[PDB]
Design an enzyme around this catalytic site. Structure first.
Site, PDB file in Angstrom:
ATOM      1  N   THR A  48       0.833  -1.225   0.000  1.00 38.76           N
ATOM      2  CA  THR A  48       0.000   0.000   0.000  1.00 38.76           C
ATOM      3  C   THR A  48       0.875   1.287   0.000  1.00 38.76           C
ATOM      4  O   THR A  48       2.067   1.223   0.228  1.00 38.76           O
ATOM      5  CB  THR A  48      -0.980   0.045   1.202  1.00 38.76           C
ATOM      6  N   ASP A  49       0.237   2.426  -0.230  1.00 31.42           N
ATOM      7  CA  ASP A  49       0.892   3.744  -0.080  1.00 31.42           C
ATOM      8  C   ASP A  49      -0.036   4.641   0.749  1.00 31.42           C
ATOM      9  O   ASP A  49      -1.096   4.203   1.190  1.00 31.42           O
ATOM     10  CB  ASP A  49       1.214   4.352  -1.444  1.00 31.42           C
TER      11      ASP A  49
END
Lengths: 126, 126, 126, 126
Positions: free
Chosen positions: C13-14
């Site tokens: 994820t970011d």
């Protein structure tokens, strides 16, 4: 210290909204590479000789997070230099503040064997 | 130990032909997540409560490399559990062989403050 | 189609709270590796035959996000197989919803030169 | 074109001894961020306005590899700007050779909904 200054990229964050802990090791590697480049013996030229720099261990302590687009500095110091190995220490600064501290220990390899550090490399490390 | 078994993906390697050192921390995170999932309290449900598990420090020692497509196992052990923190140890095995060892220490956060570990979490960690 | 099943890891994820778009190409690579293994001819074996599969181009269309801990499937389909190249398409499903669609085009090299796809390799791709 | 200059980091390579194809999309993201910063309207400021730039699709064609420590440039060009979307194209040069070409298409959201691109944002994109 040798200073490496860097901005956080979006892909370096995770869903917690911080830089993922594993990316700090990547930042340290970038800092080591610029250290060597800046001293005129880049790691790429070491690899051309048939030398490998081998990581033995690594440690990071995380005090405050880094966020997307933060400007930070990795201040690198040579901690130890022996016949076969060397150790760097790192402090990650953001604004006035130490946000993490780390260290990495390395040795060197040529023709599948551990070699003592070439005098040419000792010169740039020292 | 809790065992996490994993195969090396091509993108996890670097030009040295080994798994990049920073990816070991990612493997440990996957192992911690499967540990919690396997015990029926996945980290995702912790995050739904508004809990964050915060990494304090991490250490890895690298003994032998991992190569593309190697099958390896991360054997996880709970090393320490206090009111506020917990510590995991990890051994990475390939075939008979310990290829790396590591540890990570964690604490927990809710509503921007450090919280003592909920009894429900103590239950799954223990 | 060949079905590859996968769970989203936190580091994938970011800060947007979604899987970073670049990681989809890593998931597709994993899917290709599993497809080749299922056929009894893993890519690692090809490497041991002094072969490399080289990516020519890649495309991904992103329709809905994947989040941390989502389980998803990548449906891999051979689109084209010629003397020198092959093309896969991919559909990423979450529950029964297509979340992304993609394709990759590849060729093969040996000795730094482009080679016709070996007959033994055409056999497992088809 | 807006020119973004970059050196390949060791962790960006894989066992093929080249930059992994997925990392090109990370380089393009960096180029977009630098473009927006150069205009006095960094993406971080947009985030502070409760906006998100959402990627619709991406394509990259890979012509020649990049290697560890290569210096390269990403030439960014606006291809399309409409009420709701914009498209960038990218050419990656090493020395004077085009090594890869790509494009990305984007939209904007606020409150989990698609919004018309603010006039202040159209101003820096154009």
């Amino acid at each position: 210290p040798f200073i490496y200054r860097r901005r956080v990229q979006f892909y370096e964050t995770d869903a917690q909204g911080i830089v993922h802990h594993s990316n700090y090791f990547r930042y340290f590697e970038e800092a080591r590479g610029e250290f060597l480049r800046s001293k005129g013996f880049p790691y790429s030229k070491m690899r051309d000789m048939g030398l490998e720099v081998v990581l033995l261990n690594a440690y990071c302590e995380y005090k405050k997070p880094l966020f997307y687009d933060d400007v930070f500095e990795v201040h690198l110091n040579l901690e130890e230099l022996s016949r076969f190995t060397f150790t760097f220490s790192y402090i990650v600064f953001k604004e006035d503040i130490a946000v993490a501290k780390a260290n990495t220990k390395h040795c060197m390899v040529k023709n599948g064997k551990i070699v003592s550090i070439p005098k040419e490399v000792l010169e740039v490390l020292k």
